[PDB]
C-alpha cells in the first residue's frame, strides 16, 4: 500500500589513509537497488536489484556523476564539521545523510525526509513542512543559517515533491513484480527443552517480504511482551526476512501458549501452537 524511497550517504574521514570514503546506497521500501563506493577501482553507480537494470547508460552516468560531486561536497563538509566542533585532523569522523519520500497507495507524497548526522548524532533535519530546519546543536545552527540564506529548503522540497515521487512511482511499476507482491511468512513452532521442568517455545517466520511483521506470544490469550524474547528482523540474503520470538515455559503448560503472526501476505492473522504429533 504505502511505499517509500530513501537514499543513505555515509562519508567517513580516515586520517593518513587518504580521501574520506563516500558510500551511497539507495533503497525502495526494504529492497536495495543502487550503490556507490568511492573506494571502488572504477567508482560507478551500480545496480543491486534486477528491475533497475532496465535503465539507460545515460541514467547510470547521471547517477555516477552525481555521486562523484556529492563525495567531493561531503569531503569538504567533513572539514567544515571539524571547524564547527574544533576537532583535530587526527581523528576519524562520519557524516551520514538520509533523504527520501513517503507515498500512499495512490502514490501522492505523504512525507518528505532529509536528516543529517555527525558522528552518529543528530545534526540537522528538514522539517515536515519541507520549508524549515531543525538543528541539534549550535554547530548545526551555523549550518542552518547558511541553508536558510541559500534557500536550500526550496530545492529539497522541489526534489522531494517531484523528482523523487516520479522516480519512486517508476521503480514501483518496473519492479511491480517484486516490489508490490508480498511474500507471506512460513510459520512453525519448535520446542527446545532447557531441562526436565522447563522448555523454550520458538515461533518462526521465514522468507517474508516486506520486513514489517508482528510476532507475539499469548498464554491463555493473555499477552506476554514482558516474558517474550524478540530478535531483530534479519535478512536471509534472498531479499526476504526472518524473525522469531521465544518464551520459556514450565513443563505441561505448552498448550496454553499461542503465537500470533501478522503480515501483509497473510489474509487473516494466524494463530499457532506446538504440534509434536507431526
Amino acid at each position: 500500500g504505502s511505499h517509500s524511497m530513501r537514499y543513505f550517504y555515509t562519508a567517513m574521514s580516515r586520517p593518513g589513509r587518504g580521501e574520506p570514503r563516500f558510500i551511497a546506497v539507495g533503497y525502495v521500501d526494504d529492497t536495495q537497488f543502487v550503490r556507490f563506493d568511492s573506494d571502488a577501482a572504477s567508482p560507478r553507480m551500480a545496480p543491486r536489484a534486477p528491475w533497475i537494470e532496465q535503465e539507460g547508460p545515460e541514467y547510470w552516468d547521471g547517477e555516477t556523476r552525481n555521486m562523484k560531486a556529492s563525495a567531493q561536497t561531503y569531503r569538504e563538509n567533513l572539514r567544515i564539521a571539524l571547524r564547527y566542533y574544533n576537532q583535530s585532523e587526527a581523528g576519524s569522523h562520519i557524516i551520514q545523510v538520509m533523504y527520501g519520500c513517503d507515498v500512499g497507495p495512490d502514490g501522492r507524497l505523504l512525507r518528505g525526509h532529509d536528516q543529517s548526522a555527525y558522528d552518529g548524532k543528530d545534526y540537522i533535519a528538514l522539517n515536515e513542512d519541507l520549508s524549515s530546519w531543525t538543528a541539534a546543536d549550535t554547530a548545526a545552527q551555523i549550518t542552518q543559517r547558511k541553508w536558510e540564506a541559500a534557500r536550500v529548503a526550496e530545492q529539497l522540497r522541489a526534489y522531494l515533491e517531484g523528482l523523487c515521487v516520479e522516480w519512486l512511482r517508476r521503480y514501483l511499476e518496473n519492479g511491480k513484480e517484486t516490489l508490490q507482491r508480498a511474500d507471506p511468512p512460513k510459520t512453525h513452532v519448535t520446542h527446545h527443552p532447557i531441562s526436565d521442568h522447563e522448555a523454550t517455545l520458538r515461533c518462526w517466520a521465514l522468507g517474508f517480504y516486506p520486513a514489517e511483521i508482528t510476532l507475539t506470544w499469548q498464554r491463555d490469550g493473555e499477552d506476554q511482551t514482558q516474558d517474550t524474547e524478540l530478535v531483530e528482523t534479519r535478512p536471509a540474503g534472498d531479499r526476504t526476512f526472518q524473525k522469531w520470538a521465544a518464551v520459556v515455559v514450565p513443563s505441561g503448560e505448552e498448550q496454553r501458549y499461542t503465537c500470533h503472526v501478522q503480515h501483509e501476505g497473510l489474509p487473516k492473522p494466524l494463530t499457532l501452537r506446538w504440534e509434536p504429533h507431526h
Binding site: 524511497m5 537514499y7 551511497a24 539507495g26 543502487v34 541514467y59 547521471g62 547517477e63 552525481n66 555521486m67 560531486a69 556529492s70 561536497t73 569538504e76 563538509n77 567544515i80 564539521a81 564547527y84 533523504y99 549550518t143 547558511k146 541553508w147 541559500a150 536550500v152 530545492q155 529539497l156 526534489y159 523528482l163 523523487c164 522516480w167
Partner: peptide, 10 residues
C-alpha cells in the same frame, strides 16, 4: 536523476 542533484556545503 533519481538522486538529489543539488550540492550543499555545511
Amino acid at each position: 536523476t533519481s538522486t538529489l542533484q543539488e550540492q550543499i556545503g555545511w
